[PDB]
Amino acid sequence: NIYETDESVSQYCDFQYGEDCFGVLNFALACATKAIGYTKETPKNRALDLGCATGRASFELARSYKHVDGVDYSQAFVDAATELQKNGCIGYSQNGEGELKNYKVIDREGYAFRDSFTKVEFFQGDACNLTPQFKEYDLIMATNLIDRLYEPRLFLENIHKRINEKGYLILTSPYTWREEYTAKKFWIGGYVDENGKEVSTLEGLKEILEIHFELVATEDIPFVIRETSRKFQHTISQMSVWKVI
Amino acid sequence: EKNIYETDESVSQYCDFQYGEDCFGVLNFALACATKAIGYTKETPKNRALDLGCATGRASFELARSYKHVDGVDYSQAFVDAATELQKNGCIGYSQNGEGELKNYKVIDREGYAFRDSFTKVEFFQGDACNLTPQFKEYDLIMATNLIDRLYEPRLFLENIHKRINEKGYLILTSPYTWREEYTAKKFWIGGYVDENGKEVSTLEGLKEILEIHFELVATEDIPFVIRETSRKFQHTISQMSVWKVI
């Protein structure tokens, strides 16, 4: 009897574990791979995948880190990651034409990360109010999270407390700020300030983070999300890499 | 207001899609469709063509390079105004979206495109594909790209359109079949649904059931297109073209 995910969870199962579309590398694999590259001078004892959704990037980080915590606001996402981790498979509904669907099974043993999955622990939790035990990380990776937060500065201005000195914070975002998710006054960029000048999100990130971090690198990373049998979202996130001073 | 296609944001989105730069190696969709349509209709007289759901008018201008007269019809007055402004004033401006609320101003210059040799052969009209006025008839080609999945009742259009096409003329549809209740009540979707007997209905099959009364299906092909939303976010979609010859 395979655990079956709902429609919201199915979308992220498809995104994180489905076959690559339009020749684009799997996003979680691309992000975890780069993070491992950028943190090559760290001991790689502890990583945090914050906003881990159905957990693919946590599994991928665990191939290099001794221990990886994956945390997500959504209990349903965490349940799906945990079921794949413990029982080895989960089922989901891939979007098709109209209301039509294609049922798919994700088999843990079909991925290279099968050699490391016991090094991950998944938790429900909130990036803006993490419990104190989530600390002493060599790496905190938060991919496509900041423009889903109502007040992203609440996460960003405190996160240095959970990272070891010379450890890394790695963010990605396509900077698609929207009032449905984030109050305009809390957008990190993508707005015209009171003086008429355009504020870029990377500039806003520097202003928040350069108190405790140095900006080491930026890189563009595409991803593709399936909406129907024929319609897809093709987006380019910017990765920014920050080293604790 | 209520119609998303009447908003300035949709006008700017379709200006960029129809007249702007290619993305991800995907060629301009209006030109691809018009070029393929001219190929499929090579043996017809090429006197009159209708571009139904023409949005900001690019495919109408491109059809007019080969047809003696082209009518572009859209339900959105804002789209019709934009196409007419480009046609008559020779330029229109629009906004590209960046991060968040940021925008960049761009200009479309009529004289920068090859279709500039034919733009007086187009007439643009506001109109309803599901209930066209009688004067829109006697077409050698009717091309309706990405239209059917935005119609309130697609059968009003599909069951009647053969009456507006000359004998041996063509109807050429494209659609990605993005059926949504915001555009079309589910009872009127041509496909993408499970019927009352539990069978899955594909849109192309639903199209065959309706159109094979008066048409022969001549060809299908897949055509990708890309719509920029922001400088970092895009729709990337595979439309299905179907080519129908009136019997």
Ligand SMILES: Nc1ncnc2c1ncn2[C@@H]1O[C@H](CSCC[C@H](N)C(=O)O)[C@@H](O)[C@H]1O
């Ligand atoms: N306050 C919060 N704390 C933690 N996770 C949150 C959160 N608000 C949203 N999330 C989660 O963050 C994710 C945003 S979507 C990005 C998911 C994944 N990291 C990827 O890059 O594809 C979702 O899984 C969402 O449930």
Ligand SMILES: Nc1ncnc2c1ncn2[C@@H]1O[C@H](CSCC[C@H](N)C(=O)O)[C@@H](O)[C@H]1O
């Ligand atoms: N009943 C109707 N009659 C005419 N046009 C309609 C319509 N319902 C929707 N439309 C138009 O159909 C278009 C859908 S998007 C497709 C636009 C263009 N043909 C392209 O291929 O890119 C919009 O321009 C919309 O205004």
Ligand SMILES: N[C@@H](Cc1nc[nH]c1S)C(=O)O
């Ligand atoms: N998403 C675009 C393109 C489109 N047209 C028809 N279907 C689809 S998707 C729109 O809604 O106009």
